[PDB]
Structure formats: C-alpha cells, structure tokens
Amino acid sequence: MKVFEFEVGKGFLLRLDYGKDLVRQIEEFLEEKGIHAAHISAIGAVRSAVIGYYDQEKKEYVKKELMEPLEILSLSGNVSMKDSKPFCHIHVLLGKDGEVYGGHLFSAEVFACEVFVLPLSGEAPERAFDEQTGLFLWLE
Amino acid sequence: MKVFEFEVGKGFLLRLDYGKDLVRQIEEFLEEKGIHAAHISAIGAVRSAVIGYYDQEKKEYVKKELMEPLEILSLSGNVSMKDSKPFCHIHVLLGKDGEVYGGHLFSAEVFACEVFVLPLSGEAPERAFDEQTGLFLWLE
Amino acid sequence: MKVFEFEVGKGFLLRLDYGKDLVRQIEEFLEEKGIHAAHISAIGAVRSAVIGYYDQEKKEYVKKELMEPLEILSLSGNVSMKDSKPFCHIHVLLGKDGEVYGGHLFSAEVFACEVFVLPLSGEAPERAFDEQTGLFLWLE
Ligand SMILES: [Zn+2]
Numbered sequence: 001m002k003v004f005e006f007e008v009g010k011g012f013l014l015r016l017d018y019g020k021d022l023v024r025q026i027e028e029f030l031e032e033k034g035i036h037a038a039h040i041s042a043i044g045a046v047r048s049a050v051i052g053y054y055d056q057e058k059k060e061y062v063k064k065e066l067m068e069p070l071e072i073l074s075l076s077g078n079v080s081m082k083d084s085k086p087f088c089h090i091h092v093l094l095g096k097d098g099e100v101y102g103g104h105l106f107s108a109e110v111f112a113c114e115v116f117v118l119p120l121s122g123e124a125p126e127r128a129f130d131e132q133t134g135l136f137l138w139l140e
Numbered sequence: 141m142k143v144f145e146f147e148v149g150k151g152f153l154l155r156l157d158y159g160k161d162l163v164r165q166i167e168e169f170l171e172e173k174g175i176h177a178a179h180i181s182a183i184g185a186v187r188s189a190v191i192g193y194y195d196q197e198k199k200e201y202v203k204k205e206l207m208e209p210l211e212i213l214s215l216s217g218n219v220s221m222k223d224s225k226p227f228c229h230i231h232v233l234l235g236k237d238g239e240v241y242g243g244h245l246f247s248a249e250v251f252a253c254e255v256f257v258l259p260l261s262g263e264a265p266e267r268a269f270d271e272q273t274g275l276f277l278w279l280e
Numbered sequence: 281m282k283v284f285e286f287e288v289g290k291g292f293l294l295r296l297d298y299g300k301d302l303v304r305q306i307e308e309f310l311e312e313k314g315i316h317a318a319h320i321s322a323i324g325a326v327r328s329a330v331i332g333y334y335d336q337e338k339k340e341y342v343k344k345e346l347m348e349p350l351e352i353l354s355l356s357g358n359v360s361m362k363d364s365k366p367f368c369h370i371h372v373l374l375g376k377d378g379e380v381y382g383g384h385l386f387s388a389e390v391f392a393c394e395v396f397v398l399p400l401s402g403e404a405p406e407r408a409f410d411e412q413t414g415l416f417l418w419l420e
Pocket residue numbers: 089090091104105324
C-alpha cells in the first residue's frame with residue numbers, strides 16, 4: 001500500500017463560471033495557486049457532461065454523453081501530479097429524481113457549481129502507468 | 141470565477157437526533173458555534189425526505205417527496221451566509237440497493253445520522269440573487 | 281444531539297492494493313498510525329463488493345452481493361472507536377452509467393482505489409448499542 005502524508009491549512013470555496021468546463025476551471029485555479037495535491041468536493045448543476053466507466057479487462061474507458069441538464073448529486077476526487085502539472089481525478093453522480101448516472105468525470109458544462117478545495121501540503125503523488133490496471137496510478 | 145480563501149482548524153462529528161429534521165439540526169449547531177462557512181458531509185439513514193431538481197430554463201425547483209425509510213448514500217454540501225445567518229446548501233443520494241434518488245435536499249427526518257462539519261475560517265460567502273441562473277449564488 | 285470537537289492537522293492520500301479488501305486496508309492503515317477518529321473519502325473502482333441497507337423496523341441489515349466490476353461513484357465515511365479499535369463506517373455508490381447501487385459498505389475487493397483520510401485529533405467517539413435504532417451509535 002502506498003501512503004502519502006500531508007498537512008492541511010488552507011481551504012477554498014469556489015463559484016465556477018456558467019457555460020465553462022467544470023474540470024478545466026478547477027485546474028486553472030490549481031495552476032494559479034500552485035496546488036499540486038488536494039481533496040476535491042462539489043455540488044450544483046451542469047448543462048451537459050461526459051462521463052464513463054473503466055473496463056477492467058480490456059483496460060480502457062467507455063464514455064457516455066449526457067446532453068441534458070442534471071444536478072451534480074455528488075462530486076468527489078483529488079489532485080495530484082501528472083505530466084508536470086496538477087491533474088484532477090474526479091468521480092460524479094449526476095441526475096434528477098430516480099434518473100441517476102455515475103462514473104469517471106471527463107467534462108461538464110457548468111450551470112452553477114460550488115467547489116470545495118482542500119490543498120494538501122506535502123509530497124504530491126505522481127501518476128505513472130500501472131501495468132496491472134492499465135491506469136495511471138500514484139507512484140512516488 | 142469567484143474565489144473564497146479560508147484556513148482550517150477545528151473539526152466536528154455530530155450524532156443527530158432521531159425524528160428531527162436533518163437540515164434544521166445542522167443549522168442549529170452552526171448558529172450555536174457561530175460557523176458561517178464550512179464544508180459538510182454525512183452518512184446514515186432517514187425515515188423520509190423532500191428533495192428536488194432545478195429546472196434550468198423555467199428557473200424553479202421541482203421537488204419530490206419520499207415517505208419511505210432510505211439510506212443516506214451520499215450527503216455533501218457547504219455552509220455560507222444567506223439573510224445574515226448560516227445557510228446550508230446540501231445535495232444527497234438516498235435509497236437502497238438499486239433504488240436510488242438524488243437531488244437538492246430540502247428536508248429529511250433523521251433515523252441515524254453522523255455528520256462531519258469542517259468549519260472554514262475567513263470571509264464567508266454571501267448568497268445573492270443571480271439573474272443568469274435564477275439561483276442565489278455567492279457574491280463575496 | 282451529540283457533538284464531538286476536534287482539530288485537524290495532517291492529511292493522507294492512500295493508493296490501495298489491488299485484489300485486497302477496501303475496508304480492511306484502511307483499517308490496517310488506521311491501526312498502524314493510531315488514528316481513532318477521522319473523516320473518509322475515496323474514488324476508484326472495485327472488482328466486487330458487498331453492501332446493504334438497514335431495515336429500520338426489523339432493525340437488521342439486509343445485504344446485497346455484487347460480483348461484477350464496478351466504479352466507486354462515491355465513497356464517504358468516518359472512523360471512530362468500537363470494541364477498542366478504529367472502526368470504519370462507510371457508505372458507497374457503485375456502478376456504471378445508469379446502473380447504480382448504493383448502501384452501507386461491508387466489503388469490496390479493490391481494483392484501483394485512492395483514499396483521502398482526514399484524521400481528527402480529539403476525544404474519539406465510541407460506538408455503543410442504541411435501543412432506539414438497533415445500531416451501534418456514538419456515545420462519548
Ligand atoms: Zn476514475
């Protein structure tokens with residue numbers, strides 16, 4: 001098991017811009033503050049999105065397009081280093097009433113989004129290709 | 141994009157009272173401690189609830205009543221200032237097995253609820269009417 | 281209402297081992313570090329899992345087995361003391377696309393899992409049998 005230790009100090013609440021990508025805005029914020037490791041959470045609504053699941057056998061993602069407004073029922077994830085820059089790994093649950101979709105988040109157009117960011121001060125984990133899963137998991 | 145910066149220090153785990161409203165109990169706690177900004181998370185189960193989704197075009201909420209015991213599969217949100225008092229904005233996923241419902245949380249009767257409250261020390265965001273969404277979003 | 285106060289300081293991001301139980305790995309980590317109270321969060325995917333819901337009348341859990349790879353759409357919980365050792369209480373949402381399952385988490389074989397652990401420094405809550413719900417809730 002890989003263990004990454006950190007200290008917490010700052011906290012951020014963000015109001016994302018309407019009509020822009022959710023993931024892209026967070027990453028822009030991260031770059032601006034120089035945050036390389038963090039825990040992410042959010043709620044709100046999106047105008048559309050692109051999610052997907054990971055085929056654990058073929059070792060590839062399978063995405064789904066959703067071109068309908070949905071509530072961000074749940075949004076959670078983390079920040080780490082990939083290709084020399086802060087990289088967001090986020091999972092979500094979008095929908096309304098009994099209509100629920102979930103998976104790895106690729107993109108989402110924001111309607112109204114409030115994001116909580118908890119930066120983690122310490123060695124930022126780096127994502128490297130992992131043979132076993134076919135994903136880019138933390139190494140050191 | 142609006143950015144609100146804070147420092148973290150305290151942490152709270154609460155055991156809510158059976159038969160009382162989930163949102164109301166948290167709000168009472170916040171008033172007592174004078175918490176104006178925070179991140180919220182909870183798990184447990186409820187005896188009933190009122191959730192809803194936001195029609196992004198008509199600009200109004202559409203609620204759903206659930207008068208059946210449900211598990212709190214996911215509860216996340218934040219605290220901010222609205223009408224000069226701590227205001228909770230929470231989204232949830234309630235249900236059992238494959239029966240899942242989700243949305244903006246209005247009310248929930250508690251069965252057993254464990255809440256994690258992470259107060260945020262800094263300028264609390266205030267909610268003001270936003271023309272674009274018809275929602276009450278953070279101004280400053 | 282019961283209130284447990286804490287101070288936050290450290291933060292941990294863990295990369296769980298493939299093919300091992302999710303809950304057990306976190307618990308081994310908590311024991312090694314001596315964490316008696318904390319907030320938990322995670323995302324990733326599992327190869328199989330066992331969840332369930334609580335019948336609030338009969339006062340007993342009803343389990344559900346899932347022997348199919350699933351994405352961890354949402355994983356949230358807390359750590360506390362039970363039987364004199366760190367005990368995890370976790371709720372999850374597993375699935376893909378519109379196939380979503382949710383409930384109290386009993387076990388899950390890890391495919392790839394990134395866990396965020398926020399230890400809470402203070403008097404750790406202890407779980408004791410509660411007549412009203414039939415669950416083991418926090419006392420003091
Ligand atoms: Zn993922």
